[PDB]
């Protein structure tokens, strides 16, 4: 099932009223994860960063995968990476699998013991759109639907 | 459209790992707001108080007898937009003591809010409020 992702940028005024800019994206839910919506602030984690460096409960991990031959022995599989994130309070995880499309099977290999939070992958222009904000922008919220 | 609400309590671990306790309850979407899911930290707002906050919160607002606030600053529908104006990702109203608020909300039906407005009552607001009241930090997940 397809996942609609929204990345929201926001400025307060001095008065306290907020002003937001939404960008829409389409990815897919992994069967490694629940098929629920989730929303929460974005944390960019390196894949080397998933093996008390704590973050507030309910963040949305955005993770750009590496060429797979640039990682002979991963500390964890991409499955275990998402599972780690969750243990550390990730409300959801989003992988950019543009460099590592084998990863989709690896995720969907874990459908026997799925996580109660959503694991979403994105490729192509929808990943491009995502990472371009996550990199440039200060600080963002993500909403994942349906 | 009925709304399923999970309230989440959580504790980090010596190892930086979280442990959660989730309490579920059922409420309803108002046609005055969008029928979408939403998640966010809970901020308890006092009704007088919607006439300072991190973007993406979920407002929990307990209404009171309309006999006791008889010069209201905004309609209850107004209070919700105000909350959204102030970064609320969704608003939850406990309408146990002002049941005619259902009516006001679902009357804004024709011109709605981008975010969800949900009303709860009875044993479901009792659960929600019995957590929110005991000043912990909590997360709210609202599900369509």
Residue numbers in the entry:
A (entry chain A): 54 to 104, 110 to 204
B (entry chain B): 54 to 104, 112 to 204
The authors write:
Rspo (R-spondin, also roof plate-specific spondin) proteins are evolutionarily conserved from fish to humans and have well-documented roles in a broad range of developmental and physiological processes resulting from enhancement of canonical and non-canonical Wnt signalling. ZNRF3/RNF43 specifically targets these Wnt receptors for ubiquitination and turnover, hence reducing Wnt signalling responses. Direct extracellular interaction with Rspo proteins inhibits ZNRF3/RNF43 activity. Here we report a molecular level analysis of the ZNRF3/RNF43 ectodomain structure and its interactions with Rspo proteins.
The ZNRF3ecto crystal structures revealed a distinctive variant of the protease-associated domain topology. Two β-sheets (comprising β2, β1, β7, β3 and β4, β5, β6 strands, respectively) splay apart, accommodating an α-helix (αC) at the open edge; two additional α-helices (αA and αB) pack against the β4, β5 and β6 face of this distorted β-sandwich. A disulphide bridge, conserved across species, links two structurally elaborate loops, β3–β4 and β4–αA. The crystal structures for apo xZNRF3ecto, zZNRF3ecto and mZNRF3ecto showed no major differences in the main chain conformation. Comparisons of ZNRF3ecto structures for proteins crystallized in several different crystal lattices, or for crystals containing multiple copies in the asymmetric unit, consistently highlighted an acidic region (N105-E114; residue numbering is for mouse sequences unless otherwise stated) within the β3–β4 loop, the short αC–β7 loop and the extended β1–β2 hairpin as flexible elements of the fold. Our crystallographic data provided independent structures for multiple copies of the ZNRF3 ectodomain in eight different crystal forms. All but two of these crystal structures reveal an extensive interface (average interface area 992±109 Å2) formed between two ZNRF3ecto polypeptide chains. This dimer is conserved, and pairwise structural superpositions yielded r.m.s.d. values of <1.3 Å (for 275 equivalent Cα pairs). The interaction is twofold symmetric; strands β3 and β7 of the ‘subunits’ abut face-to-face at the core of the dimer. Intriguingly, these structural features interact in a parallel (cis) fashion consistent with ZNRF3 associating as a dimer on the cell surface.
